Design a protein around this ligand. Sequence first.
Ligand SMILES: [K+]
Ligand SMILES: [K+]
Ligand SMILES: [K+]
Ligand SMILES: [K+]
Ligand SMILES: [K+]
Ligand SMILES: [K+]
Ligand SMILES: [Mg+2]
Ligand SMILES: [Mg+2]
Ligand SMILES: [Mg+2]
Ligand SMILES: [Mg+2]
Ligand SMILES: [Mg+2]
Ligand SMILES: [Mg+2]
Ligand SMILES: [Mg+2]
Ligand SMILES: [Mg+2]
Ligand SMILES: [Mg+2]
Ligand SMILES: [Mg+2]
Ligand SMILES: [Mg+2]
Ligand SMILES: [Mg+2]
Ligand SMILES: [Mg+2]
Ligand SMILES: [Mg+2]
Ligand SMILES: [Mg+2]
Ligand SMILES: [Mg+2]
Ligand SMILES: [Mg+2]
Ligand SMILES: [Mg+2]
Ligand SMILES: [Mg+2]
Ligand SMILES: [Mg+2]
Ligand SMILES: [Mg+2]
Ligand SMILES: [Mg+2]
Ligand SMILES: [Mg+2]
Ligand SMILES: [Mg+2]
Ligand SMILES: [Mg+2]
Ligand SMILES: [Mg+2]
Ligand SMILES: [Mg+2]
Ligand SMILES: [Mg+2]
Ligand SMILES: [Mg+2]
Ligand SMILES: [Mg+2]
Ligand SMILES: [Mg+2]
Ligand SMILES: [Mg+2]
Ligand SMILES: [Mg+2]
Ligand SMILES: [Mg+2]
Ligand SMILES: [Mg+2]
Ligand SMILES: [Mg+2]
Lengths: 116, 53, 110
Amino acid sequence: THHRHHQETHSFLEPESYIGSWEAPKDPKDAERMLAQLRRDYAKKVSLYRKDYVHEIEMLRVEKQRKDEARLVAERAANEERRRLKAEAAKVRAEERKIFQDEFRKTLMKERAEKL
Amino acid sequence: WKITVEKLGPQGKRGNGGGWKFVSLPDGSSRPLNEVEKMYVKREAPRRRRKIL
Amino acid sequence: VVRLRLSRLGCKNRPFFRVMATDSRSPRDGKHIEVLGYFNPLPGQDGGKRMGLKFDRIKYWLSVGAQASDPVQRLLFRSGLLPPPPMVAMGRKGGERDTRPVDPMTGRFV
RNA sequence: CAUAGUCAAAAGAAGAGUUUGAUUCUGGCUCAGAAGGAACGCUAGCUAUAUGCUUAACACAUGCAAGUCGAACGUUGUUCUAAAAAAAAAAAAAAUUUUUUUUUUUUUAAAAAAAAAAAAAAUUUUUUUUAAGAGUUGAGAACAAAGUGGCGAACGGGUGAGUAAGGCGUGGGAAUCUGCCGAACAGUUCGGGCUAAAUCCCGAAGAAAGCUAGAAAGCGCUGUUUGAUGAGCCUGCGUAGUAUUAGGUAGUUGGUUAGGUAAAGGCUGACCAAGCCGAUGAUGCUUAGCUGGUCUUUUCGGACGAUCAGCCACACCGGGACUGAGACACGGCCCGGACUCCCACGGGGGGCAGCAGUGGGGAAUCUUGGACAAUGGGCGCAAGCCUGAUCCAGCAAUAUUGCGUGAGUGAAGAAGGGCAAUUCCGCUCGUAAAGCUCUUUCGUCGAGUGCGCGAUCAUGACAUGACUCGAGGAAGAAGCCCCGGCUAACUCCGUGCCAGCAGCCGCGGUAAAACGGGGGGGGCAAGUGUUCUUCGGAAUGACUAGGCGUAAAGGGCACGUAGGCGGUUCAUCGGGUUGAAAGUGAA
Ligand SMILES: [K+]
Ligand SMILES: [K+]
Ligand SMILES: [K+]
Ligand SMILES: [K+]
Ligand SMILES: [K+]
Ligand SMILES: [K+]
Ligand SMILES: [Mg+2]
Ligand SMILES: [Mg+2]
Ligand SMILES: [Mg+2]
Ligand SMILES: [Mg+2]
Ligand SMILES: [Mg+2]
Ligand SMILES: [Mg+2]
Ligand SMILES: [Mg+2]
Ligand SMILES: [Mg+2]
Ligand SMILES: [Mg+2]
Ligand SMILES: [Mg+2]
Ligand SMILES: [Mg+2]
Ligand SMILES: [Mg+2]
Ligand SMILES: [Mg+2]
Ligand SMILES: [Mg+2]
Ligand SMILES: [Mg+2]
Ligand SMILES: [Mg+2]
Ligand SMILES: [Mg+2]
Ligand SMILES: [Mg+2]
Ligand SMILES: [Mg+2]
Ligand SMILES: [Mg+2]
Ligand SMILES: [Mg+2]
Ligand SMILES: [Mg+2]
Ligand SMILES: [Mg+2]
Ligand SMILES: [Mg+2]
Ligand SMILES: [Mg+2]
Ligand SMILES: [Mg+2]
Ligand SMILES: [Mg+2]
Ligand SMILES: [Mg+2]
Ligand SMILES: [Mg+2]
Ligand SMILES: [Mg+2]
Ligand SMILES: [Mg+2]
Ligand SMILES: [Mg+2]
Ligand SMILES: [Mg+2]
Ligand SMILES: [Mg+2]
Ligand SMILES: [Mg+2]
Ligand SMILES: [Mg+2]
């Protein structure tokens, strides 16, 4: 995600010795056997590379999963604390409300009796 | 021919403007950029402004 | 089969290629699963060609078993994601070359 | 340190002529702009990229468009030949011989090296014939010549007839399948049949299938777990016009039980109940493929769905199923019908809405081209073979902010044309032309290298191209409309309410700036005018952004259904609302 990471974690590779390493055989029926052996050697390196890519993606996925697992419980703890604060705030508001409600109730009974 | 391989995607970002680059010479070896290649990288990037003059 | 192949862009006598992951029965310029990068077949002003690839996505498709076609094998090898193709171990076809130096700005011989 | 850092995502808002003797308002008609899969007139130099039957989903001559595999399998039907490795450059007409070492058999425990006919030698040698249904004939070549079989012809390509929701856009779901491709785990045993065989078919166990020491631990198949990609099914929301169409439905709506499907389900057989849709527009009629998007426009809207890309439907017109992982299958099969062509007259054959191409219709729309070199696809272990997919050429001012048709100088103010109290070289065409100096872009002609480049390990149709150099001479290249007002631009002659012009107001009746010609001038420019279609101007259907006393327009007046709209405080909740994050919004 940065310049330094791609500077320091890039395999820069050496000159490959596989290029132009063919020799001319004396028999055409022999050369095609080495040609097919080169073709057989290519497929083994491909599946070795396939197994190497499978390891890295799974190792990325498990780290992403544990990161999400950490974030979830941090959010659950914070939300439990917020709920605990708000519940007692509602409780003290509900307890302070009743005295004004009761004092309002008495005068309505008083003013209805005087009209009666 | 030589090539200039660019690592596209959000994980291959060299920064705000493009992706990281390397060469990979025809013989199978790869090197970091020269000053000429670094100038090409600098001069082909997008710029975050309206066109002045 | 899922394949990594090239789709043609650009215009007449001016090619450009896009490395795309497509289903094998799709048209050349049609439906695709993902776009993976670009490739410029023409030589640029620096004397070389240009290529960009999405490394994580090509890793994922190779891990689940996509089959690259015959130029994509060459380009993924030169990018260093695949082993070399079998026929590159043969050495170039040598011979004489017209090595007369040419002035780069005017196209006439120096 | 640094291949760091910069926080951009728009622009776009115009008026004029015409009702009246004159005025203001309402209200239409017309014009100035942008554009097109366009057509026609007149006139035309070049390069490149795009585009090109919008009508008859009318009928088609001719050629090409889907094949591949001898590394799955037999058959017959050609051909020419009778152990291996190493060396041969000098002395007294020459392709095949000379020498050494391993190795197989025969002949007499060491050594040697098929039959018939004629000749010679002491069993062999020279020639021929038949050999090889033959006490194993040893190697090589193509077998395409015909077949069985496997994979692919369900991809790619075309058209928009039908379809108003079984489709499409967007987001989801559970009751399913999935050849080829990736990764595990186990097997690939034995009989029979197709003239002959098998990876073809039948059987038994548990499912099967074998090939290759020419591809021997290399291919293939079968079973079981899984990734990935596709496919079947279901669904919430959104998606024409019409009320001068008000009722529609009878397997119709649900239930039970059976059958069927890979899979939920009235999908349908039997039985039971009378439900279901509808004034929030069912049904009937007309029209239409849908989307990403194209043109236009100070945001909104309107017209369109042509090229390209995603989904769907269709393949002469109707109806079926087989094979297959996948079809109810454009160049596969069966049946019916219309048309059409052969026939030896018994009957067969055909479907260009694949690429070229031809009649027909029309105002109008293209070559019966080259190549698989690049990309993509099928078959093949590969080598390779197919590919009117594609790539590239041909035609057409059909489109695009392109380029060129010269740059200077020149007064004998030439000739000629037009006008003139007939003023100022009389005014003008006019420095305009002719002539002189310079340079050759585009085009023309002649040559040269070409791993310049598209392509690399090699493979170049384009390419008679492009690039570089040379020859030349201003040499080959400017028209279309207009000049009364709207609207930039004026004079002479002919006509005489005639001929005629015209987008609107209007001109023409003997001095026409309006008709036709001479001259002169204005605007665009390889274009420029006429017609058709769309948007704007048009606030001229007004959400943005109008109205109803006298101009078009308040129901004769109420009551009420649906709908729409509608007081205060306190508390609870979290569907709308809102903030963040993730997925998605193809190119
Ligand atoms: K209706
Ligand atoms: K879509
Ligand atoms: K049919
Ligand atoms: K090809
Ligand atoms: K034209
Ligand atoms: K000229
Ligand atoms: Mg009046
Ligand atoms: Mg037809
Ligand atoms: Mg076959
Ligand atoms: Mg098809
Ligand atoms: Mg087409
Ligand atoms: Mg269409
Ligand atoms: Mg239709
Ligand atoms: Mg407007
Ligand atoms: Mg529509
Ligand atoms: Mg068409
Ligand atoms: Mg098949
Ligand atoms: Mg079946
Ligand atoms: Mg077919
Ligand atoms: Mg056909
Ligand atoms: Mg055709
Ligand atoms: Mg005609
Ligand atoms: Mg290919
Ligand atoms: Mg293959
Ligand atoms: Mg132009
Ligand atoms: Mg030239
Ligand atoms: Mg030339
Ligand atoms: Mg080349
Ligand atoms: Mg040419
Ligand atoms: Mg004027
Ligand atoms: Mg007159
Ligand atoms: Mg006029
Ligand atoms: Mg006139
Ligand atoms: Mg409007
Ligand atoms: Mg009004
Ligand atoms: Mg009112
Ligand atoms: Mg009234
Ligand atoms: Mg009235
Ligand atoms: Mg409250
Ligand atoms: Mg809420
Ligand atoms: Mg988001
Ligand atoms: Mg997009």
